[PDB]
Amino acid sequence: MRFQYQALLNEHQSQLDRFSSHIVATLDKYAHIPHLISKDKELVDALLSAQNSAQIDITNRYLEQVNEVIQAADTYLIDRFGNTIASSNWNLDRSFIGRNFAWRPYFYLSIAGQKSQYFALGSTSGQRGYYYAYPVIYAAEILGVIVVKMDLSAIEQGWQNKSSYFVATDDHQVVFMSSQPAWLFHSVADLSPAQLNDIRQSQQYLDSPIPSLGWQGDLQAEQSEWRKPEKHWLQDDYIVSSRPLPELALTIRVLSPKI
């Protein structure tokens, strides 16, 4: 079987190439949309007359149309103070209208004039998403931020292997996407109270308890093994190959049971 270990690592490299490709192709359908619509009349006019209900009506219906064309979860416009003033979900139970997101990194970074991206557990929706944001600029001034939130299903559904698993981990090794849903919002390895407090303060996963999956291993290695404490009652160990995707601040990992 060890006569098969290198071959498995080689196959892992191909799986990571194919999945990373799928991820990039899927995100590419949404990444440029905030810039595309950012200066559109409907968005700028709303930011300039945010308390004009007829204008907000026009802008809400436009964002709803855009959101349907791109098949995103939500597309919404935020003023320069962080308040959502128009949104594709204005007519849904999860309406973001009136909610303030100045505390979210995608708003903090984009109101400073740059494009930004982020992933999180949605605070109003309760749904995970990948977020792209872009500043709305008119007459050389930043007036607000436009955001597109993408549901993660098409990415997770692209993992079709039935003999291996994948997880996408953030910088604290918290599992944000996975082919095993039970591992979502758990860390790969134990975290200290201080680390858990930092995650909680960021609100990236809201108030989610972040339990530990308890694996041990070199989480910084491209090719490694994850094991449980010796003599533990379940030794579900794995051969694990990892591929960081810096732009996304996520590392993709493929896990194959060892033996």
Are the C-beta atoms of 256 and 8 separated by less than 8 Å?
Answer: yes
Alpha carbon distances (Å) from 145 to 38, 46, 72, 172:
8, 12, 17, 28
Residues contacting residue 154 through CB under 8 Å, at least 6 positions apart: 26
Kindly state the smallest distance separating residue 146's Cβ from Ca ion, in Å: 10
| Residue 207 CB burial class (10 angstroms; 0-12, 13-18, ≥19) | exposed
* Closer to Ca ion by Cβ: residue 222 or 237: 237
Residue type at 110 in one-letter notation: S
Is 125 annotated as contributing to ligand binding?
yes
Kindly state the smallest distance separating residue 227's Cβ from Ca ion, in Å: 9
Number of residues that bind Ca ion (CB under 5 A): 5
* Closer to Ca ion by Cβ: residue 61 or 258: 258
Counting contacts by CB under 5 A, is residue 1 touching Ca ion?
no
Q: Which of 9, 18, 40, 152 binds Ca ion (CB under 5 A)?
A: 40
Kindly state the smallest distance separating residue 241's Cβ from Ca ion, in Å: 17
Counting contacts by CB under 5 A, is residue 258 touching Ca ion?
yes
Helix axes 53-70, 41-48, angle to 10 degrees: 150
What track of x and - describes contact with Ca ion for positions 178 through 217 (by CB under 5 A)?
Answer: ----------------------------------------
Are the C-beta atoms of 183 and 163 separated by less than 8 Å?
Answer: no
- Under the rule (CB under 5 A), what is the footprint of Ca ion? 39-40, 237, 258-259
Q: Which residues are known binding-site members?
A: 36, 40, 104, 106, 123-125, 131, 149, 237, 258
